[PDB]
Design a protein around this ligand. Structure first.
Ligand SMILES: CC(C)(COP(=O)(O)OP(=O)(O)OC[C@H]1O[C@@H](n2cnc3c(N)ncnc32)[C@H](O)[C@@H]1OP(=O)(O)O)[C@@H](O)C(=O)NCCC(=O)NCCS
Ligand SMILES: CC(C)(COP(=O)(O)OP(=O)(O)OC[C@H]1O[C@@H](n2cnc3c(N)ncnc32)[C@H](O)[C@@H]1OP(=O)(O)O)[C@@H](O)C(=O)NCCC(=O)NCCS
Ligand SMILES: CC(C)(COP(=O)(O)OP(=O)(O)OC[C@H]1O[C@@H](n2cnc3c(N)ncnc32)[C@H](O)[C@@H]1OP(=O)(O)O)[C@@H](O)C(=O)NCCC(=O)NCCS
Ligand SMILES: NC[C@H]1O[C@H](O[C@H]2[C@H](O)[C@@H](O[C@H]3O[C@H](CO)[C@@H](O)[C@H](N)[C@H]3O)[C@H](N)C[C@@H]2N)[C@H](N)[C@@H](O)[C@@H]1O
Ligand SMILES: NC[C@H]1O[C@H](O[C@H]2[C@H](O)[C@@H](O[C@H]3O[C@H](CO)[C@@H](O)[C@H](N)[C@H]3O)[C@H](N)C[C@@H]2N)[C@H](N)[C@@H](O)[C@@H]1O
Ligand SMILES: NC[C@H]1O[C@H](O[C@H]2[C@H](O)[C@@H](O[C@H]3O[C@H](CO)[C@@H](O)[C@H](N)[C@H]3O)[C@H](N)C[C@@H]2N)[C@H](N)[C@@H](O)[C@@H]1O
Ligand SMILES: [Cl-]
Lengths: 274, 275, 275
């Protein structure tokens, strides 16, 4: 129903080639490949073939073969098992928009599937171990969720009605899915609570181990259990300039023309601050 | 003979059907499928077939397939590679009893296999990243465990004898394996120390990131590194009542008959006000 | 790669001209490692003629529960293909990284060896599989992303690398030594060590579960917390000094067994080696 990462890349780049499967195929992979022509990879030529590596180990083996030298990433090959891997173009993850050059792990892929995330910006870097989950209801006698597997139609109706009016947003009910900005960095073993967080601002840094229970302002650096603001990456004038310029939506050419201002915040302020 | 999750479900529900394997069969699967007829899934019909998706992606595929619309969870299908998934009936994980509708990840599966856990309650929800490990010996010149691979039988015997006497339970020696109660909730990146914890009480909530180094009282809410008690979910009076009522052992029929009391603590204390 | 996997180094050392019997579903990567050898799908296996390679841990568990495994000895006659961080009875390489005997860690630390963040990991060291070791990205530019560099032309890349190599805060662990992780070190679950700011986890160090380690851990220090702080040292300053000279973790196997009384009892260790 919803285009996988691989499905989006093939639409964009397969360009009528056949798919050369590198590695042991899976049922999920074969279903995704039914509309196209595909075969077990043997001799591969990027004029004729698109290489799908099934697992990361498959990709590792393929990138080690001399036959891969003529294949360029995403344009001519991809890994099937890496829904959170970044791409050179804006993509969808389970109906969540994800910007260019943004990566995350299966925890966040799940959070996208669970409806917890509104979007993830560009050039955002999320450690694979990050976790994003909602709270369960905290205003009933039980805290379990799978208890509802035992609920009949009537029990489940009252259960849902009280979830729906709970202002603490159990299961992120009746709140906005959170936006994760562009140029965000999230370190290892971090948690973001989907019941109380709607906003991880542009440029925000979430340090390793941080348990993030409330919104992170743009370009704030938060650490600790629970996450506290340690510092801001830039002055407020530089932050508001960054929020107006939005360099993370710049074209590739634009990124290179102004590389100097991207590596020097001082020149960035100088060029764009007024 | 320690039975997988899948074997326990097949024993209960297969009901003379044939197993239809949805996905690539692994050796762990074929060892588990030994007492049953099975084939590679092609056309399936829950009248003659119980479908075993091997991986999570296999189940995703199967459930995306139109042949699945007639298959009920656990009754007619299961994922083999999810030893921690919840079930509608009480089960074993490495001979550790697990209540109904309780789920957890591979780390807690590993804890069951390592012998760290006596039992896990009903309607308990444990994030898949939770870790439960014991301490190594802390009173020896060395802290390694795998050094013992180099011990000969006599060396190993003195090593084991000191371990068995250690009051601080390295490798959880000489202590009770821990209980995890019912209606327990454990967040992401949590840790429970198997050497120093014997019980996660009924109804406890363990916050994300919490490092749990001592017993968590029933219905306590613990957070932090290390975990400390921020509050209890219910009054002192309600906790005693809950511990007597034990709704988590109720029948499905009782859960629906008394759902009003499950949904409102206020009503629960009226209904069970005089025990 | 140019570089030998753990399995490649084990076969080189012990295969001894035998055929490889594959226990489990082979992978394309495994089949490439096995290419120069005669190999086959494990049916009946005999350690005189076969070396068993289990593909996954699940396969290893299966093999070791099969009666056919009784004759096979760890590493000498069988290994797991996909356990690059597992322990070995001899010192080995993980990518460019020396790793001592009976030392294990998980894929996070494997990745850290591949990234260039680790100089060496000592002997008899135990690292929980969830441990993470990563560096900081640049903190003195307009952006913090790394994959933005996938868009850099050659000129853009050059000014980017130029500034990075001048940064005294070591983004991507630039301009610093890769960290050494000592011998007889213990690292608990959900621990993090910052490769930008740490160059040394001393011998004997204990890093507790949940710790965020932002600076060097002295030898035999016990550190906990976010950020990690020293709770105690395992031994007195004089025994630490004695341990760092004796380096029992470099001892041979017979030495370990002859001196097991000193390894078990720090007090006897001291009377013997402390001068
Ligand atoms: C936040 C981060 C990116 C860099 O911030 P920084 O500028 O280096 O911060 P500093 O080193 O100046 O630290 C300043 C203060 O913040 C604290 N601090 C910084 N990072 C912290 C963290 N992750 N946890 C707890 N405290 C932290 C320091 O203890 C110090 O405290 P003090 O000021 O009270 O003495 C880094 O610490 C981090 O977490 N990077 C993650 C790397 C990683 O996880 N690897 C891969 C994941 S993708
Ligand atoms: C603990 C939890 C259940 C909610 O409890 P709560 O009482 O609503 O928490 P509140 O934020 O309202 O306030 C509780 C107090 O403890 C703190 N706190 C709450 N949760 C915390 C956590 N996980 N870690 C650290 N501190 C926490 C709050 O900051 C506040 O502290 P204060 O007294 O010093 O101001 C929830 O925050 C949580 O941790 N859920 C984890 C979600 C998850 O990981 N899911 C996976 C499982 S499948
Ligand atoms: C660090 C550790 C080894 C125990 O050390 P210890 O010498 O027993 O220290 P204790 O727990 O008795 O107490 C030391 C103090 O530090 C605190 N502390 C100890 N370990 C801590 C941890 N991991 N996190 C936070 N705080 C901790 C204690 O609360 C205690 O209180 P105090 O400072 O107020 O006195 C242990 O706690 C640990 O982390 N084990 C690892 C389990 C694991 O994850 N295993 C899998 C790996 S393969
Ligand atoms: N190699 C060194 C670099 O590694 C990390 O960044 C990497 C990610 O690791 C990688 O992600 C992949 O691996 C993750 C971890 O397993 C998975 O979650 C994810 N789905 C998967 O695509 C992205 N593709 C590319 C990105 N630059 C660090 N942040 C970075 O500082 C470090 O320099
Ligand atoms: N989907 C949305 C729900 O997700 C989580 O609950 C889920 C579990 O995640 C899932 O678990 C599975 O996935 C885990 C994560 O990989 C594995 O560890 C585990 N072994 C595996 O069975 C259980 N089967 C069903 C349970 N209700 C949240 N707690 C809940 O708030 C949220 O509403
Ligand atoms: N079984 C119980 C023992 O378990 C852990 O020690 C084990 C490691 O778990 C294991 O590691 C393996 O599993 C890890 C977890 O997935 C992977 O990261 C790793 N790559 C993989 O080789 C090593 N081989 C052996 C070591 N003794 C505890 N530390 C120890 O106190 C406990 O007694
Ligand atoms: Cl039952």
């Amino acid at each position: 129903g919803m285009k996988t990462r691989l499905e989006q890349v093939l639409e964009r780049y397969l360009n009528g080639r056949e798919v050369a499967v590198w590695g042991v195929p899976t049922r999920r992979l074969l279903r995704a490949l039914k509309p196209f022509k595909f075969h077990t990879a043997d001799r591969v030529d990027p004029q004729y073939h698109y290489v799908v590596a099934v697992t990361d180990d498959d990709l590792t083996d393929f990138l080690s073969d001399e036959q891969s030298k003529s294949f360029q990433y995403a344009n001519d090959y991809l890994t099937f098992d890496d829904e959170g891997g970044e791409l050179p173009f804006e993509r969808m993850c389970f109906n969540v928009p994800v910007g260019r050059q943004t990566y995350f792990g299966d925890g966040v892929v799940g959070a996208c599937e669970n409806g917890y995330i509104k979007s993830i910006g560009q050039f955002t870097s999320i450690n694979g171990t990050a976790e994003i989950h909602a709270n369960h209801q905290l205003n009933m006698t039980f805290v379990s969720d799978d208890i509802q597997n035992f609920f009949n139609e009537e029990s489940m109706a009252v259960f849902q009605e009280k979830l729906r009016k709970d202002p603490k947003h159990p299961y992120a009910y009746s709140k906005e899915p959170m936006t994760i900005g562009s140029d965000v960095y999230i370190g290892a073993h971090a948690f973001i609570n989907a019941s109380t967080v709607t906003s991880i601002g542009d440029g925000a840094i979430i340090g390793s181990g941080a348990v993030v229970l409330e919104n992170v302002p743009p370009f704030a650096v938060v650490v600790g259990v629970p996450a506290r603001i340690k510092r801001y990456r830039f002055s407020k004038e530089m932050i508001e300039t960054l929020l107006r310029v939005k360099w993370w939506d710049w074209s590739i050419e634009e990124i290179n023309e102004n590389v100097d201002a991207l590596i020097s915040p001082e020149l960035f302020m100088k060029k764009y601050g007024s």
